Amino acid sequence: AAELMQQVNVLKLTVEDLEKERDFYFGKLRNIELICQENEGENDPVLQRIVDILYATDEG
Amino acid sequence: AAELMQQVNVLKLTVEDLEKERDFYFGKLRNIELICQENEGENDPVLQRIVDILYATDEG
Amino acid sequence: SMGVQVETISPGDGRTFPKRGQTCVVHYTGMLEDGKKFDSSRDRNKPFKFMLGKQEVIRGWEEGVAQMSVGQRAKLTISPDYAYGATGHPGIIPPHATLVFDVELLKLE
Amino acid sequence: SMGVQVETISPGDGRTFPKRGQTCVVHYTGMLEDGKKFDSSRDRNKPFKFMLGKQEVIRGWEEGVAQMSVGQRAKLTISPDYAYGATGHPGIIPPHATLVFDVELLKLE
Numbered sequence: 381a382a383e384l385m386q387q388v389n390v391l392k393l394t395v396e397d398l399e400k401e402r403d404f405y406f407g408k409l410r411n412i413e414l415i416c417q418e419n420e421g422e423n424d425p426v427l428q429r430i431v432d433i434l435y436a437t438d439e440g
Numbered sequence: 441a442a443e444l445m446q447q448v449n450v451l452k453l454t455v456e457d458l459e460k461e462r463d464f465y466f467g468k469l470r471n472i473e474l475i476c477q478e479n480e481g482e483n484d485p486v487l488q489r490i491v492d493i494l495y496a497t498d499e500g
Numbered sequence: 501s502m503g504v505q506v507e508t509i510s511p512g513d514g515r516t517f518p519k520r521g522q523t524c525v526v527h528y529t530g531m532l533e534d535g536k537k538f539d540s541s542r543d544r545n546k547p548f549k550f551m552l553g554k555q556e557v558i559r560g561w562e563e564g565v566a567q568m569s570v571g572q573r574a575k576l577t578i579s580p581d582y583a584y585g586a587t588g589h590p591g592i593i594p595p596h597a598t599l600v601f602d603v604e605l606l607k608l609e
Numbered sequence: 610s611m612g613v614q615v616e617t618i619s620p621g622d623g624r625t626f627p628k629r630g631q632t633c634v635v636h637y638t639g640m641l642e643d644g645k646k647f648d649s650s651r652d653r654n655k656p657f658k659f660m661l662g663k664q665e666v667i668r669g670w671e672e673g674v675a676q677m678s679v680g681q682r683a684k685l686t687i688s689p690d691y692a693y694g695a696t697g698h699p700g701i702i703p704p705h706a707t708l709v710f711d712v713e714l715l716k717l718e
């Protein structure tokens with residue numbers, strides 16, 4: 381009858397999965413970002429192009 | 441009675457949200473990665489520390 | 501409470517409003533609800549650009565900027581379900597965080 | 610079908626198996642089910658490390674490596690719900706992709 385509770389409990393797994401994966405990528409990006417802010421004083425053209433991607437929209 | 445369908449339809453929104461956000465961060469990381477593979481020939485110690493984070497686990 | 505509230509700091513032209521498909525070019529500073537700065541486009545010394553309708557930003561921004569005209573400077577008060585909601589933004593934005601932005605619509609590309 | 614199947618390429622010591630909380634140190638190459646390589650730790654010229662039990666990897670890896678002993682080289686066949694499932698891995702791993710790994714358990718830290 382109310383099998384929706386099985387659909388519901390499935391979906392909750394998906395969000396715990398997706399959120400972990402999202403957090404993980406984000407954490408990597410933050411860290412790459414601090415790597416940059418720890419050399420933000422090397423007037424480096426490559427590190428600067430990575431700080432551009434860091435705050436860009438995949439559109440551009 | 442079967443309000444679970446409202447819980448279900450809410451959760452589906454969360455996964456479409458989380459998946460978009462996950463994909464976006466991942467896309468940024470990929471791009472930062474190609475930036476590196478397009479200079480992977482500069483024996484650069486900073487870019488090398490970013491390729492380390494790129495394939496690390498946040499544990500380490 | 502209201503998903504995003506937009507309040508004028510200084511008016512824009514009153515005529516040119518973003519349409520979907522246009523790129524909005526913006527300067528911004530973001531603060532937590534208690535006023536702690538956490539980001540400014542002016543810092544990275546580059547305007548932030550995004551396309552309206554492409555789902556590229558939190559809904560507080562999509563719905564907020566869409567109500568500004570070119571040149572306008574607005575205060576955007578965004579509630580959590582239009583920002584990062586429950587999860588928040590690891591280590592930067594707590595859960596259920598209200599966010600305030602100071603936003604300037606510079607031009608439409 | 611089976612979440613992860615592990616097949617010996619060359620045996621390990623047969624005695625030392627990962628416990629939860631240990632760091633596994635690994636070399637690997639990953640392929641799609643049709644054999645298209647998409648990654649190798651040997652390429653980035655560094656073993657890949659992870660902690661068992663910390664949920665750091667897809668379940669095919671957590672459950673797979675956990676059944677290898679030190680020195681073993683195994684073939685891991687992972688089905689989609691133990692890998693990237695429906696979503697897949699944007700542009701690299703399609704949806705519902707079966708993945709095959711060639712994995713070597715080098716040591717336990």
Ligand SMILES: C=C1CCN2C(=O)COc3cccc(c3)[C@@H](CCc3ccc(OC)c(OC)c3)OC(=O)[C@@H]3CCCCN3C(=O)C(=O)C(C)(C)COC(=O)[C@H](C)NC(=O)[C@H]2C1
Pocket residue numbers: 406409410411413433434435436437457460461464468530538539548555556557558559561583584589592
């Ligand atoms: C290390 C990095 C990883 C994450 N990152 C970026 O990805 C680059 O900056 C962006 C560019 C476009 C869109 C986005 C952010 C999105 C974030 C991803 C996203 C996309 C869509 C969502 O729906 C559809 C959503 O949720 C439903 C979430 O951000 C936004 O839309 C809003 C409105 C536009 C201006 C930025 N915005 C904010 O709030 C902020 O000022 C920040 C950037 C969070 C404050 O800086 C930080 O916290 C830490 C120090 N650095 C980052 O967080 C940067 C650098």
Ligand SMILES: C=C1CCN2C(=O)COc3cccc(c3)[C@@H](CCc3ccc(OC)c(OC)c3)OC(=O)[C@@H]3CCCCN3C(=O)C(=O)C(C)(C)COC(=O)[C@H](C)NC(=O)[C@H]2C1
Pocket residue numbers: 397400401404408466469470471473493494495496497639647648657664665666667668670692693698701
């Ligand atoms: C641009 C980057 C962004 C994404 N990235 C990394 O993040 C660094 O490499 C990792 C380190 C630890 C764990 C992870 C991956 C996770 C990925 C995130 C994650 C974490 C947990 C999950 O559950 C809990 C999950 O889903 C439930 C997902 O990967 C894994 O666990 C398995 C088993 C361990 C070895 C790597 N693995 C694979 O499959 C692969 O060989 C790759 C790396 C995907 C093939 O390289 C690519 O595709 C593209 C070219 N580069 C990347 O994808 C790299 C570089």
